[PDB]
Design a protein around this ligand. Sequence first.
Ligand SMILES: Nc1nc2c(ncn2[C@@H]2O[C@H](COP(=O)(O)OP(=O)(O)OP(=O)(O)O)[C@@H](O)[C@H]2O)c(=O)[nH]1
Length: 158
Amino acid sequence: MYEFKDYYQNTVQLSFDDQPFSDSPKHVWVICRFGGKWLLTEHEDRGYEFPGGKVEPMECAEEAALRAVKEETGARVKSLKYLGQYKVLGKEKVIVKNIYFADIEKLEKQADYFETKGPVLFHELPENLSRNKKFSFIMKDSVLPISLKKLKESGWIE
Ligand SMILES: Nc1nc2c(ncn2[C@@H]2O[C@H](COP(=O)(O)OP(=O)(O)OP(=O)(O)O)[C@@H](O)[C@H]2O)c(=O)[nH]1
């Protein structure tokens, strides 16, 4: 596994095995790709980040991942694939977040933006996200580069 600190100096435990920290994860994170471009969302407070969110009642992690993509980017996933899972050790609460890769089939219109500003398309992600104020803190740690390298080698990009 991988153990490092996040933007707010909280301990993050990253692994690429089939749900090692928890079999019931309360959070999801979806690395989206619309062909040759990265599909991101713009949170009203945080900024630029990959779609994600909490798992709702009578919903599984995979269901929550597809919903978060539609709720934040309004996109339909062609193939959702489990990449890994991470544990964030905060001051009081501990969060178990599931990492998913979504190959985007299409981008459709949305009626409401759930704390978001709609879909965002990037041909290539900026050189330093930890310095970039337009991006979210969830993009400003080692979870993002390690996952992209694993994703690269998966490799389902092509
Ligand atoms: N590093 C990192 N920390 C995260 C991520 N998502 C959430 N956190 C941390 O999790 C905490 C917030 O978790 P939430 O689930 O949103 O908690 P909440 O909104 O107060 O309320 P609940 O819905 O009851 O959980 C903060 O300490 C964040 O730093 C993530 O993707 N990466």
